[PDB]
Design a protein around this ligand. Structure first.
Ligand SMILES: CCOCCN(C[C@@H](O)CN1CCC[C@@]2(CCN(c3ncnc4ccccc34)C2)C1)S(=O)(=O)c1c(C)cccc1C
Length: 330
């Protein structure tokens, strides 16, 4: 049975509204993980219960090279804890922010691994990810993609089955989500389009600080590209960012296969992508197992604390979540 005393708390990697992620060491084993610590009360107060449970289930039910592997999930009286493999390479934003733009070859590499993962979720798990934004994309110690944060996922979506919940980050929402009249799995390909656009172009495809104007742009405004962008990259992004999902690349019965067959990915052997046989164009230059150079000093400088028998307490502000007794099979 695993508790918070089983870990040494080393460095704060990030913190937000719902809690924080801390680099930890499991004391018995000497292994290093990223622990995401959610405050139960805040989860409840902002109606994030169903999402947090979906996150837990999807993490437990999935196995893929480019999805974060869950080692443990457990709860205290006021906290939910996810212990996953540490993404040593940091967020894609860390690198994109500083380098402005990724090469087309680098973006192609990251795109391939995202497609591989999303194809797995769609085809094998009947899952639509729904939250494909730059922020959720990280890099492991080797420079391979890790998709994180599965709380917005929709389970049991088979073929052309629809979904209704309006969810996701404003700048990343598909036109059909904004229309609020049902959407399908192709919203994930819209997200691939937005994320690959950021990588290659250095900004969002659509932006306004007023949300209503932003949504007008996403719905109505035709996509434009910096004029340095190659023809194949422009074609893929145009296909991925079609407003009408039925006209969108990956929006048909073939799903991911249509994107896999696109000329931008020519020569890409897709089993080799899965097997990580493609050498990442950027290898993270971490010098130790606790090196956090790819996380903002803003977070890593901060002190770690114990707040910012109760093992059966089930209240309305702090509920006893089910399926938080997980330890990955050795
Ligand atoms: C109910 C909605 O809750 C939404 C929860 N929140 C979203 C984060 O998960 C976003 N995440 C996007 C990718 C980067 C990381 C920061 C560090 N981190 C990881 N760092 C290293 N290895 C990993 C391995 C696996 C997973 C994460 C990591 C995740 C945060 S947040 O805004 O509250 C928050 C923020 C904004 C920062 C840190 C903790 C929380 C809880």
């Amino acid at each position: 049975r695993v508790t918070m005393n089983e870990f040494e708390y080393l460095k704060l990697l990030g913190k937000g509204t719902f809690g924080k992620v801390i680099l930890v060491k499991e004391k018995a084993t000497g292994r290093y993980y990223a622990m995401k610590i959610l405050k139960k009360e805040v989860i409840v107060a902002k109606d994030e219960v169903a999402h947090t449970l979906t996150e837990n289930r999807v993490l437990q039910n999935s196995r893929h090279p480019f999805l974060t592997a869950l080692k443990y999930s457990f709860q205290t009286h006021d906290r939910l804890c996810f212990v996953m493999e540490y993404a040593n390479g940091g967020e894609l934003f860390f690198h994109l922010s500083r380098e402005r733009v990724f090469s087309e070859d680098r973006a192609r590499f990251y795109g391939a691994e995202i497609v591989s993962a999303l194809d797995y979720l769609h085809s094998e798990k009947n899952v639509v990810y729904r939250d494909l934004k730059l922020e959720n994309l990280m890099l492991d110690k080797d420079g391979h993609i890790k998709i994180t944060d599965f709380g917005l996922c929709k389970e049991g979506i088979k073929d052309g089955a629809t979904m209704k919940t309006f969810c996701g980050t404003p700048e990343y929402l598909a036109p059909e989500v904004l229309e609020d009249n049902d959407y399908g799995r192709a919203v994930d390909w819209w997200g691939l389009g937005v994320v690959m656009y950021e990588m290659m172009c250095g900004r969002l495809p659509f932006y306004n600080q007023d949300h209503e104007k932003l949504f007008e742009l996403i719905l109505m405004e035709e996509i434009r590209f910096p004029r340095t962008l190659g023809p194949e990259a422009k074609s893929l992004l145009s296909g991925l960012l079609k407003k009408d999902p039925k006209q969108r690349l990956g929006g048909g019965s073939e799903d991911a296969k249509e994107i896999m067959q696109h000329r931008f990915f020519a020569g890409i052997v897709w089993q080799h992508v899965y097997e990580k046989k493609l050498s990442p164009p950027f290898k993270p230059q971490v010098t130790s197992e606790t090196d956090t150079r790819y996380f903002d000093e803003e977070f890593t400088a901060q002190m770690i604390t114990i707040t910012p028998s109760m093992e059966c307490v089930d209240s309305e502000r702090r509920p006893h979540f089910p399926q938080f007794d997980y330890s990955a099979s050795s």
